Copies of this chain bind each other. A is one copy, B any other.
Amino acid sequence: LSFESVGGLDNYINQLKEMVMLPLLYPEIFQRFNMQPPRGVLFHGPPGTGKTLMARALAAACSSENKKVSFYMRKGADCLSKWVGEAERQLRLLFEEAKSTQPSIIFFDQIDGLAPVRSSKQEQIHASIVSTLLALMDGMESRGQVIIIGATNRPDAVDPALRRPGRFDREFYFPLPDRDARKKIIEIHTRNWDPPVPEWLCSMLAEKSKGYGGADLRALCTEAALNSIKRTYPQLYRSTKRLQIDPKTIKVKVKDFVMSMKRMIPSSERSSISPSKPLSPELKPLLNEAFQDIEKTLQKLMPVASKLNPLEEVMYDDPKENDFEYQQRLETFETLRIYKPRFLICGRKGLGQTALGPAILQQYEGVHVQSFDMSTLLQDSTQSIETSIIHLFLEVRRHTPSIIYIPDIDNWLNVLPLTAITTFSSMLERLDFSDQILFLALSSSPLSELHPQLREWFSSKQSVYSLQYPTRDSIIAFFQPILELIKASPTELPGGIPRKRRVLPELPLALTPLKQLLIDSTTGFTVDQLLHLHSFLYQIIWNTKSEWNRNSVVDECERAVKEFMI
């Protein structure tokens, strides 16, 4: 498994192949420069993302070389016992034995349980284990060629004196795979699968996922395998002994995947709500004209161009790299292009925004979002609201680029007390004018009457977008799938045929006028009520899903519309 069954994390592999693989085959290249090359890593991130996978793949891609790189394991707090001087005696002969087998690695795991923050508010035994392990990582004599690797979820409860250079000195991050890391993950765990899956749905299964992560994508593919067995042999669930069965007659088809997509929740959505979903396809030919102008405007206010791996960036050539100037020109153009970006979707009540906000918020992959709205700002009663505001700002300031997102800003100013509006408005000006954070907001009161604090923010005419209601020569495309359904129904719709019952073997032991009428009857409607007509006459199609005569339903759905204006 020599680094082949790990997808997406290409950049950290080349940074890892200089600590254990490349002082060892080229020792003379480190003796000109008189250096250590360093011996510490630290892994941190959200749960289920490929953390302990790399520490297993690394110790499997070293023993297959006959170079004899021995290593060790830990299981959290495991050098801890009831006797007095026992808890430190293990840590002496752990590092002692590691020296006498000189090329050696040590893997801790969940180091939060072992080394907390030193304070006088706890027992004294947790101070001695921290103070000892801090001391023999670099004493006044060296520790030999010993590489230390740790991992945890919350990288803040470890002691800050244990995060110095010389001890850990290299922090990584596994940020919940974005778009096409999921394309490679879902093709690793479905490798052989003898009628092999084509490319045209592996690019489709990636797009439906928006935050499964590397631990849930294996559970998606292993559930669709279990759904395929139930399709071909239902007799297996109704026995106790073995049966004469034959493999190599089961094929994972498309239906086994999509029925496994519907009944599975991912890992990070079981507690929270995760506000992002794409546009509804029935809603598409009414808002995509207004959608593209917003996506084109946001490129100017925050360019979010991707990151290149360094081995594909140094492979080019460049003639003039000696001067102190022209080095302060590459990142300078990408620095003052941005200056405090902000945006709104203001307009009338319900003609837009509530289905257009989370359409934008699922495009950016690249990022880390938050939500400063209700139901997450006051959903606990232990702290105040002036403390839960500060805790989110401490998170959004790291892991740039980021997005602050508030839906329904108009009621948001009438509910929070006034000593919390000032606290939120204070932290917006402490951070500098050049970092890459955004500020989305969605209002419902139209222009020239909005609240006098939304004018103190956003301070421009570029960062406000009006939302006028739609363009009569586009509504004839909105009802176009309906008129393709009022045309005759020879069970074109799914239904009408009570299909079949499968017999099982034994398996022994071993149309002109209403189209005009739809036009000069609404003519001023908003989309909030345009869904109502689409959700009214759609019931009329369901009740006539099996009749065979079409000159009569079209008089029903003109009777259905003639009282709706009333």
Contacts and interface: CB of A to CB of B under 8 A. Distances in A.
8 contacts: A22-B236, A35-B225, A78-B88, A78-B92, A253-B321, A254-B323, A317-B501, A375-B427
Contact of A229 (B29, B242, B502): B29
B314 A77 contact: no
Interface stretch (A150-158, A179-187, A549-557): A150-158
A449 interface: no
Given A14-B237, A338-B535, A254 B429 contact: no
A532 interface: yes
Interface stretch (A285-293, A361-369, A406-414, A511-519): A406-414
A494 interface: yes
A76 interface: yes
Given A56-B140, A215-B166, A383-B381, A85 B76 contact: no
A325 B422 CA distance: 53
A112 to B, nearest CB: 6
Interface string A150-194: 000110110011011110010100000000000000000001011
Contact of A538 (B32, B164, B337, B433): B337
Interface residues of A, number: 180
Given A127-B116, A140-B52, A160 B242 contact: no
A59 interface: yes
Interface in A244-284: 245, 247, 250, 253-255, 258, 262, 265, 267, 270-271, 273, 277, 282
Closest 4 CB pairs between A and B? A113-B131, A81-B85, A339-B535, A76-B132
A531 interface: yes
A415 B430 contact: no
A78 B89 CA distance: 8
A29 B247 contact: yes
B337 A531 contact: no
B122 A122 contact: no
Contacts of A128: 76-77, 113
Contacts of A123: 122, 124
B433 A531 contact: yes
Contact of A240 (B65, B156, B215, B245): B65
Given A33-B225, A230-B311, 11 more contacts: A25-B241, A73-B139, A81-B84, A165-B267, A237-B311, A317-B499, A326-B494, A336-B534, A354-B430, A374-B426, A414-B422
A507 interface: no
Interface string A7-48: 000000010011000100110110011111110000000011
Nearest to A529: B459
A477 interface: no
Given A92-B78, A120-B157, A321-B254, A113 B84 contact: no
A531 to B, nearest CB: 6
Given A76-B132, A430-B407, A127 B140 contact: no
B113 A132 contact: yes
A118 interface: yes
A116 B110 CA distance: 17
A493 B332 CA distance: 11
A110 B131 contact: yes
A359 interface: no
A234 interface: yes
A493 B333 CA distance: 9
Nearest to A417: B419
Contacts of A161: 47, 153
A307 interface: no
Contacts of A247: 28-29, 32
A216 interface: yes
Interface stretch (A97-105, A387-395, A464-472): A387-395
A296 interface: no
Contacts of A505: none
A375 B394 contact: yes
A187 to B, nearest CB: 14
A68 interface: no
Contacts of A495: 333
A219 to B, nearest CB: 4
A308 interface: no
A502 B76 contact: no
Contacts of A80: 84-85
A564 to B, nearest CB: 9
A270 B160 contact: yes
Contacts of A113: 127-128, 131-132, 135
Nearest to A111: B131
Interface string A139-150: 111000000000
Contacts of A255: 321, 327
A22 B52 CA distance: 28
